[PDB]
């Protein structure tokens, strides 16, 4: 399984 | 931006034997960026419907891909495999060597 | 043996040519068993390994979600970089994640990775400790600065230890007819001359798995690394791999050289020489 979303937005490089 | 130019090696799933079915691999690596154009040739001309891996990469960033199809070898058929990359003037073709 | 689980990303710009592609692939050891393409004619996570396929709707809703969602990130860290560099607009740039953990022989967790590249450059790599980061130019320490501030790594390290462990697990049990099977090498020893007074011989490795494997020519008993050489070791196509090694000899001194080869599969290390 790759690492799940977190519950806030995903945060960009 | 540094760029860094194709291994390829040409070989045979299996042991090659004539007139008995098998793979034909063309595998590049160790390039980038990844964009990558590659052929098989039989005797000069483009095998049509060859297959490859999915993209992937080593740990020093660099692509690598497999090239196959089925092939049945015989001993005059000439084989190989045609690479171009931004890296490259002109195609790079390296032949099929039974023994390599 | 000792297993590991790693997930690698590749994010693409191509101006002109639509927005950036962003495939993913998962790998259990050297075996792929998904991908996700989001230039697919109807993108969404698709299985390569038989025993994966066993998983079910709400397993590949669930990765196809992680990943469309990581496919918009990824544009828009794409176009942060280009700025971070001070790039046009104009050029084609990748951004590549490796992550992932690597279980013992007992299946405990051994330490997990989480590594990031810009074109092809080391960027951005969270440390063994799970907790901090070493950022590789000063455009990286702009994205470390914002990941610190959002706890990014704590939410690595929950996945690493946590989840990412349990999975690979999960996988490893599932597959244990194939992914916790070593596959030796078969070996062979070819001759032919160069010349009147010179001669090749090629120490084959074929079948084996996984790739891991070490192949080494001796003369009287010392290495022979700068005259051996060396094929980059290279799939099948069947799940295997090959390598071979050569050195080219004086004509009559054949005996002189051995062959050895390491791998997982072997029990003890093998020493093979040319049989005419």
Redesign the interface.
């Known amino acids: 399984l790759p690492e799940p979303l977190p519950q806030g937005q995903l945060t960009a490089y | 931006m540094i760029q860094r130019t194709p291994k390829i090696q040409v070989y045979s799933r299996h042991p090659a034997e004539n007139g008995k079915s098998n793979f034909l691999n063309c595998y590049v690596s160790g390039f980038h960026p990844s964009d990558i154009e590659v052929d098989l040739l039989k005797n000069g001309e483009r095998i049509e419907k060859v297959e490859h891996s999915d993209l992937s990469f080593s740990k020093d960033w660099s692509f690598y891909l497999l090239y196959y199809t089925e092939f049945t070898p015989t001993e005059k058929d000439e084989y190989a495999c045609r690479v171009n990359h931004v890296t490259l003037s002109q195609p790079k073709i390296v032949k099929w060597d039974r023994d390599m | 043996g000792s297993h590991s689980m790693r997930?690698?990303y590749?994010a693409?710009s191509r101006p002109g040519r639509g927005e950036p592609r962003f495939?993913?692939?998962?790998?259990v050891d050297d075996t792929?068993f998904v991908?996700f393409?989001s230039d697919a004619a109807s993108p969404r996570t698709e299985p390569?390994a038989p025993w994966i396929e066993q998983e079910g709707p709400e397993?590949w809703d669930?990765?196809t979600?992680?990943?469309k969602?990581?496919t918009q990130?990824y544009r828009?860290?794409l176009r942060?970089?280009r700025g971070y560099y001070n790039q046009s607009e104009a050029?084609?740039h990748?951004?590549?994640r490796?992550?992932g953990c690597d279980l013992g022989p007992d299946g405990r967790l051994l330490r997990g990775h989480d590594q990031?590249?810009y074109?092809?450059?080391?960027?951005?790599a969270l440390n063994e400790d799970l907790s901090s980061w070493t950022a590789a130019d000063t455009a990286a320490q702009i994205?470390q600065r914002?990941?610190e501030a959002?706890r990014?790594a704590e939410?690595?390290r929950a996945?690493l230890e946590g989840?990412?462990v349990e999975?690979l697990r999960r996988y490893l049990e599932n597959g244990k007819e194939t992914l916790q099977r070593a596959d030796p090498p078969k070996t062979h020893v070819?001759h032919?001359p160069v010349s009147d007074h010179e001669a090749t011989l090629?120490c084959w490795a074929?079948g084996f798995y996984p790739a891991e494997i070490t192949l080494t020519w001796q003369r009287d008993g010392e290495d022979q690394t700068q005259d051996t050489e060396l094929?980059?070791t290279?799939?099948?196509?069947?799940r295997t791999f090959?390598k071979?090694a050569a050195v080219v000899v004086p004509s009559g001194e054949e005996q002189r050289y051995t062959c050895h080869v390491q791998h997982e599969g072997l029990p003890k290390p093998l020493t093979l020489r040319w049989e005419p």
Request: hydrophobic share 35%.
């Open positions: 997930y690698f590749t693409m495939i993913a692939v998962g790998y792929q991908r393409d390569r397993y669930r990765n979600q992680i990943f969602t990581n990130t828009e860290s942060n970089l050029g084609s990748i951004i590549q490796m992550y990031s590249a074109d092809g450059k080391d960027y951005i994205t914002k990941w959002a990014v939410a690595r996945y989840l990412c999975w070819t032919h090629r074929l094929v980059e290279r799939p099948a196509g069947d090959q071979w």
